[PDB]
Amino acid sequence: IADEPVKASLLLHVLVAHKLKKSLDSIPMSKTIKDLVGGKSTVQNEILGDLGKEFGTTPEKPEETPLEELAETFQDTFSGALGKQSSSLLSRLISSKMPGGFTITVARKYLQTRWGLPSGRQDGVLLVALSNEPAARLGSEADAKAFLDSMAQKYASIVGVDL
Amino acid sequence: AQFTKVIDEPIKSIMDGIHDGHIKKLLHQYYGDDESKIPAVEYFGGESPVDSEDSAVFKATSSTDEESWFKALAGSEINWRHASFLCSFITQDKMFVSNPIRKVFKPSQGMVVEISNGNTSSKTVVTLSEPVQGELKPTVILKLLKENIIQMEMIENRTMDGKPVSLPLLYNFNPDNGFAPISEVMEDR
Amino acid sequence: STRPLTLSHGSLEHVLLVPTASFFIASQLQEQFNKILPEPTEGFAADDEPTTPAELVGKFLGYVSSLVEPSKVGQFDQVLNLCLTEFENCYLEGNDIHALAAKLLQENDTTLVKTKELIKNYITARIMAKRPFDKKSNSALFRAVGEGNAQLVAIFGGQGNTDDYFEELRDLYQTYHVLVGDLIKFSAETLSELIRTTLDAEKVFTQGLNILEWLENPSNTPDKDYLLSIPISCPLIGVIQLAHYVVTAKLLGFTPGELRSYLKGATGHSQGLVTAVAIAETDSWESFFVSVRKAITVLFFIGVRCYEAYPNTSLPPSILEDSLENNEGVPSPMLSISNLTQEQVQDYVNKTNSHLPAGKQVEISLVNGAKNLVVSGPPQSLYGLNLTLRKAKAPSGLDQSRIPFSERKLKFSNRFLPVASPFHSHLLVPASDLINKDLVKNNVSFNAKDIQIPVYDTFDGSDLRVLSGSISERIVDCIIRLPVKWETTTQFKATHILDFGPGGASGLGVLTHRNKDGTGVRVIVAGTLDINPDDDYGFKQEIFDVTSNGLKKNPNWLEEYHPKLIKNKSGKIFVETKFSKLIGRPPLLVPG
């Protein structure tokens, strides 16, 4: 299957949904960052900080301009790299959770061969796996592989891929 | 805004006036307007908010607890030795180097510490003696020069002609700067 | 010479050196117990099996004690005394067993039921081995009271602390049978006498008052609504209090007059008030039941006549529906409002009283805290007040952080207390006179001289002993007419307060702790053995604790944080506070 470098719309959605501890589908794009967590002032700024780290440059007044138009405003300058933030986040995902046998590097070639999805399609499925965090203890590698299957289905359904 | 009226008054004047207003009220309410009732200490500060012998001998093993070690060495009295063994940061000029006294006296097996005149700081001498080529000989002599100097003779015995050579460490001990009274002497160092 | 004997439940195992003379007797009863002993599982998660060696020693002690008889000397009495002495020198070295039991809860994966069973087995074996607690226990707290460093006061909880007070009574009956059983059956027989003694008590008690039947068999226990009724509940609360007092006195080795003499003062909450004054009169074990008799008598009559004064009616199903489906309590004649000023609630009750007729009007019963009051009246008129309250109070998840403080809508909680009679109201005034006849007929008197320690009123907080009239009449007046200004009663400067009353976790103790937190007063729940993760109050075990764990003082903010002065060698004065001590500069900064 053909590769595709991850967009700024998905990487923005998973970063915003992850920090909230909410599902990738619970958070609508067509809403201001200030409408999301207007409750608290800290959470708003640590959202902006993590988006700033991952994408480098952010526009003036991000929080009051909803997510969708910000997506392409990052997309034009950004170039399909996991960056710094998402690199630490996937590293804590693999190390904090219990795939005690296989690391991130084994996770990549498992998706890459057994499905057939290359580097940019790996990043995209890892962003699905980050927003749907198991949180509770998982048994072994047999649960992890079945979870990676389901995260490849969600990536494929949202983006519009087939396996 | 109710108390902002005086323009171009020095911060010193204002905040001294605040501290002095607090002192006087506290003095009047709990100390009967008597300066003598206020307890005196060498240097005020360096105590963390988390919470009598003239000549003792302490022996560092590989097991000794470094908190209890430095507490025992420094002792209870607030003096130069107290600051010397409990101040975390000395002041090399304006720069904050970690306390090198704690580095040298770090509790490891072999070193033996002797305190002389421990109750009287003016003559207090802490001597640390280590096994130099098997024989346990004196290595460190931390004591006082003229009152406002901390002199740490760091002696080496394995010299050219047997007669060991002393290293003069000096530190100005300014107990008025209670946070980091120990300031290592750079001039002629 | 002693031969080694192994007793084990799977992984957990213990070795007891039985004298070779009595080893054959020991090789028999272990063989019996290893038969009785169930099959150990993983982690000993299943019930009725030990988790620790201490639990298995406990189960052996309990099993041996079950066979051994006190009247008839057997061959098992030597084994019982040898294994008991051995246990006393292998598990609870120094401190009393209660601190050990809690130790098993915090350290091991021991459940509370297993702890209660271990304590029950230990005491059962101790009393069966004819080794009572005669020695004056070396509890740190009461020793420090000996030196006078601690002033100790015992409070007595009222109604509405918990629901299943009888479940606690059952727990007490099972776990401390050997210590309480004697008082329990004495009280049971006393009430059996009182029900027939009263003209029409048998009319009131429709399912009788055979408490010992309900204690022995949980199946025989009537419905919970029968038990919550004041006539039955109030005396049984009394029993639970007195029983707790008995238990602690027997563990301490104190006589009820000795333990009373150790208290600087005592007070109760509503009904509890009578227990303290009954405790204020008791002297010795033989002169104990004469005090209890009077105490258990009054709370019986307080139950009966008050039930006749305002008997609870059948409430419309529509109101119950509304109350339940608007997340409120079951409509009862006492309603607790938290985080709301006295002047606010009195304004609200006045507003409701403006419309209602005098007979159906409500009035403030308990002033527990500044912002924790209880109103009493008709359960329909209380629901009517609830209705007015729900209009004002904001929804429980509404964030008003982004609204300026003044404009904010106040957010309080108003919950129906588990009671069946409106205490400290105008409704229970008529009964007062009938009870005063019930006081005199049964020769129920309280003398100024006979009360040893000062006991405090629930209204003015004055000592009862200075009163001109009958203290019995004053107590009646306090329990059914006068309101409880619980904050006004507790101006006493005591260092430690025992919650003998019912409730345990939700008892009067915790309410008082909250009320006067940070004054250095330490509240101990004497009715429940538990571990507080906050450690901001003690539990039962701290009473029997003899080590440094026994004497724990709560922080008095004024003295602990007292802003001091100091000066340097050069005489520069500093204001010495925590911050200033840290920095070595005055506790004033210019912010960023």
Place this chain on the structure above:
Amino acid sequence: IPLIKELRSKGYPIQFLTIGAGVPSLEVASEYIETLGLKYLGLKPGSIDAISQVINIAKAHPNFPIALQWTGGRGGGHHSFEDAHTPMLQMYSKIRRHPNIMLIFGSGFGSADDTYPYLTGEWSTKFDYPPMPFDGFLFGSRVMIAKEVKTSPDAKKCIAACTGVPDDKWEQTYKKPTGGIVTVRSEMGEPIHKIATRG
């Protein structure tokens, strides 16, 4: 933050760091405490939830000093809607169980005499609470018209003209000029108390 890292590695005399306008996350706090190598950490918690965050930080880090610099909604700069007293009445008990918290009270202080009742702790006696002493004080607006500040003399004259109001009325600064100060939204819509100048 990475600058301060180097400066602490180089060991310039930087005693502490204070994070204003809210409180960090637990992970960022832990990063700061045992990587920056300060002496202590300042925080300006906005409301009860922020105070609870400070407590959490002080819990996970019980050997590191932590300055809880509480300032009510009445302070200058970016101020919340929180009263100076009530949230302290509620949280003082909880705060004081942690030895490594130093509880600094600020907001609306420009003299020793009005702070003293908070240094003694007798302020709470009015509120029918036990006395609650504090660890220190901060003065924002007091030092504003000092000689050594860089504020322009005419600005100072405008500040000295500012009458100021007692605590009780401060909550009217969201409506009109109350003692020559009014509440205006920030650039990001955070309320700020500014001098009611034509601008």
